[PDB]
Amino acid sequence: GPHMHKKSFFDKKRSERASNLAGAVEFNDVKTLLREWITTISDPMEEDILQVVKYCTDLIEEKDLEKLDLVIKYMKRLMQQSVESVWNMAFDFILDNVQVVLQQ
Amino acid sequence: GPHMHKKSFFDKKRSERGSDASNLAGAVEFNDVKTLLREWITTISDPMEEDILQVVKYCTDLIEEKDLEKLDLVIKYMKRLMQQSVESVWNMAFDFILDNVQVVLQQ
Amino acid sequence: GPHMHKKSFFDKKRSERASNLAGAVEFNDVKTLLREWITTISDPMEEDILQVVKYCTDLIEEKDLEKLDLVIKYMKRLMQQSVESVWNMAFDFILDNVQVVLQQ
């Protein structure tokens, strides 16, 4: 019967190419991915949001809090700039779930 | 680990009433149907695939019982409310509902 | 492209008809639904498993721990009787998630 296709952006980008987001390790590569994600996709997928949360918590795990601050500040800018409420809510979720691991 | 909760609007509403024949979350009559519709587009910021597909089924069930008259109203109502949203997710949800309904109508 | 349909058993049963499972309030009605679910369906759906967990936590909420014990003991029997690992795992998940709410 009728169906919708939920395509993971980060799965595609990883398929096209140690804390990494869709394979990207360096901050300039990571911000290129996040820019393409936020500006190209209209509805962020749960999988992709959770893949970003894992990247951030992996940064916390390897104590690279410098990169984490850059990643969060960049996402804050782009996602809060968005006219779409889904991207505003996606940021709150990412932030709230990162804060929890930081506060441990 | 971290998680998101995808709650079905029409499942909730069917639990609150529920059922009375073609229905949307239990609602059979147009005036109770446009009401469940009314409440969905207006409250929910991100529509769920389940709810979108529950609407498509209702519409195709109308086509099935040849109630093309009620179907005209149901689509005409959603065409009104969904197209007039600022959120792209609701614009895309309408295209999907329409495109899938048109296919069955065009048969 | 190709796709799979996840069909909710409890949604169907509710459609065909204050703590309730697919509309059923009385224990004899609830055990009839659970019997039909476990003995009729080959692969339990996440939605249906979570709909059972909600019913069980709603019982805890209205302090009807008598009904809850009957519901769990009945599901233990039927789901552990199953040859299919999916039904065995579905029970563990329901039990583990009910214990959490009981322990609160």
Add this chain to the structure above:
Amino acid sequence: GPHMHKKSFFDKKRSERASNLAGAVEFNDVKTLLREWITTISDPMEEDILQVVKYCTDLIEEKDLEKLDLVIKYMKRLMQQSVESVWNMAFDFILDNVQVVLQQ
């Protein structure tokens, strides 16, 4: 509230590493992945089943019908050998969806 985690096996294996299954191109690599998937996982995920269907259709796309026959014959053996009905049904779905693309 209560939740289930659907972890993609092939996403994990691709993350740990032109037609490929989770990065694996050569048949011995592909059969190693399929063996670990079928023998390690109790309930196959929709995403992973659809990732296998995409690999087979990608083989059809590059006209490598030799590799496709090896992949299907191997999956037939392992998935039909399984005690779990979910794996028997997963094979039928993969085969039926491959036949559709072959019939085009």
